Amino acid sequence: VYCVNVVGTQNAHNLISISTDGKICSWSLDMLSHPQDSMELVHKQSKAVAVTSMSFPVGDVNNFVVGSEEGSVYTACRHGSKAGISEMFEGHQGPITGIHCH
Amino acid sequence: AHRKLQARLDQMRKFRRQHEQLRAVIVRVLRPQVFDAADANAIEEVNLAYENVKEVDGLDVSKEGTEAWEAAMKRYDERIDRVETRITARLRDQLGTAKNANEM
């Protein structure tokens, strides 16, 4: 697990952890005994993506973005009808080592 | 030839389905129990997004009104996603007000 981060407010927040296989899990900090919301980020006839890097936008708790070993930037929304991977970027001919929003 | 119009008709019927199933009960949700500026702002953002789709013709099966419909639903999607993140901030404020089950 190369990436784990926290958002939500002071009065309510979530722990967000993405792994190498592409499984996301929501966690509490008080309790780590089970994940809360946990699913798998897939695209391209549901291939399992190989997520390396992570960025949040500032002020966003629902939408976010990943980079990958597959040369592919994906943004992805957390919940709703388009919970999961939104879409796809191209241009890199290497495995992506780090992303950061402004 | 008729299968292109039938899918676009399916898109407009499912659009009016999700819009009416938001719209007719989101007034009951944002009714204060007997007023904010944010509630009427969210209602008028739903109304403005509905006019932002409904100025675009649904009957243009050709490509330009199809992608104008795409820009209309993308503007709609971003606008009710902004409203949805505001009520998601109110959802974090739901345990921001509460601790026990009854008021939740």
Candidates B88, B93, B95; nearest CB to A62: B88
Cα separation, B43 vs B86, in Å, equals 13
Phi and psi of A3, rounded to 5°? -145, 130
Tokens of A13: 């927040």
C-alpha A50 chain-centroid distance: 11
The b-or-e profile of A23-62 (16+ CB within 10 A means b, else e) is bbbebeeeeeeeeeeeeebebeeeeebebbbbbbeeeebb
Cα separation, A17 vs B14, in Å, equals 35
Shortest distance between the Cα of B43 and any Cα of chain A, in A, equals 20
User: Cβ of B32 under 8 Å from any chain A Cβ?
Assistant: no
Cα separation, B62 vs A36, in Å, equals 45
Residue A63's nearest CA partner among A44, A84, A47 is: A84
Cβ proximity of A2 and A20 under 8 Å: yes
Please report the DSSP string for A5-73 in residue order: EEEE-SSSEEEEEE-SS-EEEEE-SS--SS-SSEEE-EETTTEEP-EEEEEPPTT-SSEEEEEETTS-B
Measured between beta carbons, which residues in chain B are less than 8 angstroms from residue A61? 85, 88, 92
Measured between beta carbons, which residues in chain A are less than 8 angstroms from residue B95? 11-12
Shortest distance between the Cα of A95 and any Cα of chain B, in A, equals 31
Query: Around Cβ A87, how many Cβ atoms within 10 Å?
Result: 10
Measured between beta carbons, which residues in chain A are less than 8 angstroms from residue B96? 9, 11-12
User: What residues have CB less than 8 Å from A2, skipping those under 6 apart?
Assistant: A20, A52, A53
B92–A62 CB contact, under 8 Å: no
User: What residues have CB less than 8 Å from A72, skipping those under 6 apart?
Assistant: A49, A88, A89, A90, A92, A96
User: Burial level of A89, CB count in 10 A (0-12/13-18/19+)?
Assistant: middle
Cα separation, B4 vs B63, in Å, equals 11
User: Cβ of A62 under 8 Å from any chain B Cβ?
Assistant: yes
Measured between beta carbons, which residues in chain B are less than 8 angstroms from residue A80? 84
Q: Cα torsion at B25, B27, B32, B37 (round to 10°)?
A: 140
Amino acid at residue number B24: A
Tokens of B61: 């099966």
Give just the sign of the alpha carbon dihedral B52, B57, B59, B62: negative
Cα separation, A15 vs A37, in Å, equals 10
Residue B97 three-state SS: helix
Tokens of A66: 């990943």
Strands A51-55 and A47-48 turn out to be unpaired
CA distances from B92 to A8, A85, B4, B87 (A): 7, 23, 43, 9
Experimental technique of record: cryo-EM
Helices B38-54, B63-97: crossing angle, 10 deg rounding: 170
Strands A23-27 and A84-85 turn out to be unpaired
Cβ proximity of B8 and B66 under 8 Å: yes
